[PDB]
Amino acid sequence: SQLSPTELIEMQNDLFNKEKNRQLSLTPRTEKIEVKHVGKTDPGTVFVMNKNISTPYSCAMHLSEWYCRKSILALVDGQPWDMYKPLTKSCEIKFLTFKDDDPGEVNKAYWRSCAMMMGCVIERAFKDEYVVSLVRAPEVPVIAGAFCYDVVLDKRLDEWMPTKENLHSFTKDARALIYKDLPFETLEVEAKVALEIFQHNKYKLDFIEEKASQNPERIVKLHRFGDFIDVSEGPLIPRTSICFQYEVSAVHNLQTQSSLVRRFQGLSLPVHLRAHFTIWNKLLERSRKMVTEDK
Template sequence: MQKIVKTVPLFSHQSPKSSEIVEKLKSIVVSKLAQAQKNKNRINIEIPCLNQRVNLIKDYDSSCNAVNHFSEFLSNNAGLALLNDHPISMNKPLITSGVLQLLQFKDSRHDPTLINQSFWHACSLVLAATLETSFKESFNLRITHVPACSIEQGSFYAEFTTTEPLPILSIYDMESLSLVAQKLISLKLRFLPVSLDDIEAKTVLNLAEPITYAMIGDKFAYKIPDNSPELFANTSLFSRFSVTKLIEIEGAGKYNYRIFGVALPNAFVTHESTFEKLVHSSRQL
C-alpha cells in the first residue's frame, strides 16, 4: 500500500488560483483598513468585565484591539466576543458603538454554546489548511466545503476533490497529518472574516454573488456558508488536534473525499487515554 511520507513540508506551494485569492483578499483588507483610518469615524465601546470604556476607529479597530488597551492576557484568551449581545469575531473590525462582552471556555457567566460552535468550525478550517499543506502540490487538491459542524456530531470535517486518487490512509498516515495540523496551530494563526459585496465579488474575484471568506493567517482562505458561526479568534487557543478518518464521497469532481478530525481547546486539559477515546469514537462514525 502506498504510504504518505512522514516528512510532510510545513507549507506546500499553493496553486496560482488559490494564492491569487489570498493575495486579493489581503489587498482588500489593507485597503478597507486604510480607508477607515483615513475617515477617522469614531465609536465608543464599553467593556463591563474590565469596567472600562474606550474610543475606537470605526471599521478599523476590532474587539481584540479594544480589550488589548487594558488587558493583553484577556485579549489573548477570549475566543469570541458579544457586541450588544450579538456574537462577533475578535478580529472583525467594529462598526457600531455598544457593550462588548468576551467569551472564554469555562466561563460560568455565559452560555458556552456560541464559543463551542465557533471553535468547532475553526477546527474544520484548520483541517482544510492541513490538507492543502500536505496534498495540494501532489494531487492538485481543491477544498470544496468547510461546513459548520455541530459538536454533537462527534467530529468536524472538510470536503475536497483531487485530480488523482489518494492512497489508502493508514493510522500512521493520519498521525502524520495530525502533526502537520499541530505545526499549523503552533503558528498562532488568527481567523479573519472577509465579506465581499456583490460589486467587490464581481470585480475582484469574478463571482456573481456576495461571498464571505475565512482567512487563516495570511496563507489560507476558504469560502464559508452564510449560516456559519462567527469566526474563532486564534489557533493559540487550540490544544490537541487529530485527523481521524478519510472516506470517498459522491461529488462533481473526479475524486471526492471527506476527512474528519477531533480537537480540544487549551482550556480543557485531558488525559491522553481520554483523548484517544474521542479519536476512536470519531473513526467509528
C-alpha cells in the same frame, strides 16, 4: 491557462490585500467611536476607540492580560464578533469564554476554526501531479464526536484509501501548523470580487453564490490565516495557539452520482479545557465513525 502552485497563492493574497487597501481607503481619518462594557466584571466602563480600525481585542488590552488570553469570542449586541474584526458603529461589548454558562456560540466558533485549519493541512500535502478541490466545511453539532471537512481528489488517485502513516502525517502537519502562531483575519467581500479569488474550484464559486444569495446585499464572509483563505459561516477564534491537541482521525469515502466526496474527520481540544491521556483515547475512538449531519 497554466498555473504554478505558489503563483495562485500569491495571487489570492494580492487580491485580498487589494481588498484591505480598498476598505481602509474609505478615508474615515480616525473617527471616534464609543463602546460600553455590559459584562459582569467592570460594568459602566467606556471605551473611546477608532472606528473601523480598533478591535474588540484592542478593547481587552485596556482591562488586563486575562481578557486578552481567555476570551475567544465577543458578543456585541445580537452578534458574535471575532476578536480581530474592526468595529463599525457605536457598540456594547461582552466577552465570552470556554467556561461560561452558555459557551455554545464559542463552541460553534471552535469547530469552524478547527475545520479551516485542516484545509491547509490537506491541499498543501499533495503531490504536484494531483489535484485537490476543497468543497465545503459541513457544520456538525458538538455532540457528534468530530469536525468534518469535504474534499474531492484526482480521478486516478481515487482508488486508494489512506494508511495510518498518512493519517499521522496529516496530524503532524496540523500540529506543525499550530506550532508557529497564526492570527485569523476577517474580510467582507462583494460576490463579484469574491468569485475572482476562488475561481478554479467550482464548488467554492457555487457555495459563494448560494450563501451570498440568501442575504440581500450579496455579501461573502472571508477568513484568511497565513497563506490560506476560506469562506465560512459565522466568526472564528482569535489565534491558532488556542488549539492544543489536534488529530486527523478518520477519512471516509462518500460517493454521489456526479461526485466522489471524502470526509476528513478529526478531533481537537483548547489549551484551557485540555483533557487527560485516557479520556483522549476514548474520544479518539468515537471520532472514527462516519458522522452525518448535513441538513
